[PDB]
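The freezer alarm interrupted the setup, so I double-checked each line after restarting. Inputs confirmed:
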Amino acid sequence: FNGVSEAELLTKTLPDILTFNLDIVIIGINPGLMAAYKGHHYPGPGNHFWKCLFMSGLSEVQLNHMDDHTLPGKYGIGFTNMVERTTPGSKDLSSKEFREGGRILVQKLQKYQPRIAVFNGKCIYEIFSKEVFGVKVKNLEFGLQPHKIPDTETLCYVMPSSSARCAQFPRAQDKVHYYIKLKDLRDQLKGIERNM
DNA sequence: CAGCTCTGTACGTGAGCGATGGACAGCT
DNA sequence: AGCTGTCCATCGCTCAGTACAGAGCTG
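Predicted 3D structure, all chains:
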């Protein structure tokens, strides 16, 4: 990577971008190598996240990874990951690491209490749900989940991973429906608030 | 049996690498 | 004309979670 070794990138981490009063926190799986290299969220040239963000109207212009620190203030969006360690890919991670991350995640969510905790990836919500709600469903579905983060009013919303690894949703276009519904949910919650 | 859970197989786009070689201009 | 090098268009290839069958388990 411009002359920087994998071995070096393995040791890097990607900072959280979290604040109070967010509408959405996007929870990724863990940093991949390019994220680790850049120090910004979703830099992968083929990752769908920033495309979908724009295509859905969650951003009104096309942003990119370098804009990540602006999201909280301008767009009501922050970022973290279930697991902090950089890996060549998601199956390098162990169950213990995922469960550690889950515990840490829930404490962060309890602290910052966004309106919506967005799991960028079904696999990390499968783990979080078992660990946190004790629920392992036959057929976990995407979209809104029927549980709040414990002790909070923060909702849990699941999307297919923005990674272009999954074949079932081969293009950004095939994921954008979930981003549009996420936008709808945010707008509904703000409506309820305005009207109490 | 029947419902779990656990493990390994199989899967579509599009971005960007290195390799390759066609177009072309500078020089003789 | 003939030779030679750069530029750049293009190619082939690689590669960035999810669904599900079946084996194992256990009530």
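Quick read of the result. Chain A has one domain: 1-196.
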